[PDB]
Amino acid sequence: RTVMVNLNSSDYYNRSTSPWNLHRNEDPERYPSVIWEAKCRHLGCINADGNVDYHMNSVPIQQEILVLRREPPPNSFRLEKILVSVGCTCVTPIVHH
Amino acid sequence: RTVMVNLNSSDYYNRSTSPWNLHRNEDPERYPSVIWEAKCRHLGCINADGNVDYHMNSVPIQQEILVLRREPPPNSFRLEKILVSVGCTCVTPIVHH
């Protein structure tokens, strides 16, 4: 169905033990047209001393988001949902309930 | 302006050194009507031995997302943008460039 629609850091990326970089993702047909996506800097995590540790891993936190997209095409739009890397966390193989 | 719109885990939350819980957030007037939001389980981080450590902190990763919202009200909609807690990371007071 079709619906009418009106229209409207503490720098953790560096201080995190699973640090990350942002990579630009542009589509002139998508709203938002620009999405900066996180990529983990390491395979392991930075320990308290600033060294890479392979007893743990940096893994990205992905999120499902809504985006508008021109169809096929700038007048009519489609609501779409995409997977986006937001940041990184540090995990180990152990499950702590 | 108004635009016409058509319509369409590896359990890190437990294996993370900055673990988190999901809290439900419901609005029957919002699309998505349900958003599960992350809350850090601790102030510090879990070290490799499974103990809470206050040399580091769990902090949430927030993200700006698009949502549809009934105006004022179920026929016409408004595109809105909200802040959402997606997961947690582990930081320290040190900036590692």
């Epitope: 990579h23 630009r24 542009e26 002139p28 709203y31 047209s33 620009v34 700038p74 | 302006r1």
Partner: antibody
Framework: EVQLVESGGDLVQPGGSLRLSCAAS????????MSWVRQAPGKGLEWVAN????????YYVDSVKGRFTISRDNAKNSLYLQMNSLRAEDTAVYYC?????????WGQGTLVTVSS | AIQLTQSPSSLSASVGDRVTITCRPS??????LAWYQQKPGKAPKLLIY???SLENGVPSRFSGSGSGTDFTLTISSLQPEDFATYYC?????????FGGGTKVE
């Protein structure tokens, strides 16, 4: 880091040809669209052309159709602009930039002077 | 081809001034407008995309507003480094076009 280095700019007579290169580094060149934007001495910016990742789609500013040809060699991480039948109006600093709509990464530019 | 008209062509201000540039397309676009800052001799720098969104690393003194045929760029408290030329650009339809520019002195 993302780097874009243009070369090829020279002093050419009207009716001549020139091929510009843009050497990329710091990203997976084959994953992104590339663009050419020019700027005549003392004048504003003018978008020239763009090219899809696989080079299957090219777009041109009307004034350059027939004459100019955008191309890429993903193996060599390079963007190209073959400029034939050069007119005086083509005098500009040519910049290569990554992506289509909003251009964040630009090169330092290469100067093309069309004069007799 | 969508023509983009900027106003004023040039302007003079001091440090701390609230500066406002205006872009007006020939035909109404949605949010498909970007804003750039060009220091002399250097490549442009992207400030805003989607008419109102700040790019990664851009100071918060820069802000953007607008819809359809009226768009603005604002510098809340002008800094000594903001003395440059500002260009608007549309990404609504091919060929992509830029405004004539606005010099800030």
């Amino acid at each position: 880091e993302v780097q874009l280095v243009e070369s090829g700019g020279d002093l050419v007579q009207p009716g001549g040809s020139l091929r510009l290169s843009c050497a990329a580094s710091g990203f997976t060149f084959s994953s992104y669209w590339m663009s050419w934007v020019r700027q005549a001495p003392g004048k504003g910016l003018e978008w020239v052309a763009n090219i899809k990742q696989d080079g299957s789609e090219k777009y041109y500013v009307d004034s350059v159709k027939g004459r100019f040809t955008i191309s890429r060699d993903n193996a060599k991480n390079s963007l190209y602009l073959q400029m034939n039948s050069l007119r005086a109006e083509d005098t500009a600093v040519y910049y290569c930039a990554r992506d289509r709509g909003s251009l964040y990464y630009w090169g330092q530019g290469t100067l093309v002077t069309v004069s007799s | 081809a969508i023509q983009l008209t900027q106003s004023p062509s040039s302007l003079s201000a001091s440090v701390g001034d609230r500066v406002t540039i205006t872009c007006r397309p020939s035909q109404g676009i949605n949010w498909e407008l970007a804003w750039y800052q060009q220091k002399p001799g250097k490549a442009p720098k992207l400030l805003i995309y989607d008419a109102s969104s700040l790019e990664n690393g851009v100071p918060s003194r820069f802000s953007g507003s607008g819809s359809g045929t009226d768009f603005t760029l604002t510098i809340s408290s002008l800094q000594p480094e903001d003395f440059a030329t500002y260009y608007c650009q549309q990404f609504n339809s091919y060929p992509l076009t830029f405004g004539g520019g606005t010099k800030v002195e």
